[PDB]
Structures are given as structure tokens and as C-alpha cells.
Design a protein around this ligand. Structure first.
Ligand SMILES: C[C@@H]1CC(=O)Nc2cc3cc(c2N1)/C=C/CCCN1CCCc2ccc(cc21)OC[C@@H]1CN(CCO1)C3=O
Length: 117
């Protein structure tokens, strides 16, 4: 309905959109796990990205019912996108990978949101 959404209702409706992102290979690969700046040799990552976000964290929040409203899920997805757009330059591979994920999410999310009311 509105405001009051059940955790299982949200998960069953929103999880396919997240799975659509996972299916993108290799585009989802940089976003499957939280960023490890020291592992990746980018020590200034947390200085630029104030609020890290990735697919595993979003999936965890859906499975544990940490989203009360479907729009909170969408916000985390765009936070993950913006982190990659902000930290990386437009010519970089991780930037282009992110833009492919955004395209997939933009084409899948509209019907799902309308079915949730
Ligand atoms: C989201 C997180 C934080 C961020 O915002 N930017 C990044 C930045 C960087 C790495 C990651 C990175 N990702 C992560 C790499 C691990 C494997 C990711 N895949 C898997 C599939 C093939 C693949 C191909 C190219 C690729 C990455 C990549 O990148 C090209 C490199 C990576 N270089 C150095 C020069 O360019 C980074 O400095």
C-alpha cells in the first residue's frame, strides 16, 4: 500500500530488480562486495565516498527487512551508482560498468514500483 510495507512483500517485489543487476557480468563484478580501498590500492576512497554501498549490503538489507519502504531500497541503489560515478572518471572501466547497471535498473524498476502502490 503506502508507508506500511511488509518485509516479505518488499523482498519478493524488489529482489528481482537487484538480481537483474547481479546477472550483468562483468558489469556487476566491481559492486558485488564492499569496497576494500587497501586491497584495491585506492587509499583515498573513504575520503571521497562518505557512505559506501554495494550489492551485498543491499541484498543483506532486503533479506533482514531493513527497508521499511521501497523508496529506501531505490535510494541505496542510486547511492551505489553515485559512489562509482563520483570516485571514478568517465573514461574508467568501473564508471562504464556502473552506467550499464544504471541502465538495467532504470528499465526494470518502474513496473515494480507501480505494482507496490
Ligand atoms: C567499486 C570499486 C571502487 C571504485 O569506485 N573504483 C575502482 C577503481 C579501481 C578498481 C576497482 C574499483 N571498484 C575494483 C576492482 C576489482 C575487480 C573489478 N572488475 C571485475 C571485472 C573486470 C574488471 C576490469 C577492469 C577494472 C575492474 C574489473 O578496472 C580497471 C582498473 C582498476 N583500477 C586500476 C586501473 O583501472 C582501480 O583503481
Amino acid at each position: 500500500r503506502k508507508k506500511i510495507f511488509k518485509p516479505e512483500e518488499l523482498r519478493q517485489a524488489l529482489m528481482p530488480t537487484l538480481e537483474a543487476l547481479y546477472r550483468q557480468d562483468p558489469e556487476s563484478l566491481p559492486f558485488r562486495q564492499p569496497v576494500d580501498p587497501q586491497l584495491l590500492g585506492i587509499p583515498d576512497y573513504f575520503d571521497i565516498v562518505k557512505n559506501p554501498m554495494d550489492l551485498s549490503t543491499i541484498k543483506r538489507k532486503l533479506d533482514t527487512g531493513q527497508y521499511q519502504e521501497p523508496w529506501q531500497y531505490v535510494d541505496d541503489v542510486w547511492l551505489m551508482f553515485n559512489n562509482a560515478w563520483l570516485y571514478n572518471r568517465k573514461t574508467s572501466r568501473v564508471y562504464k560498468f556502473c552506467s550499464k547497471l544504471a541502465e538495467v535498473f532504470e528499465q526494470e524498476i518502474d513496473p515494480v514500483m507501480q505494482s507496490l502502490g
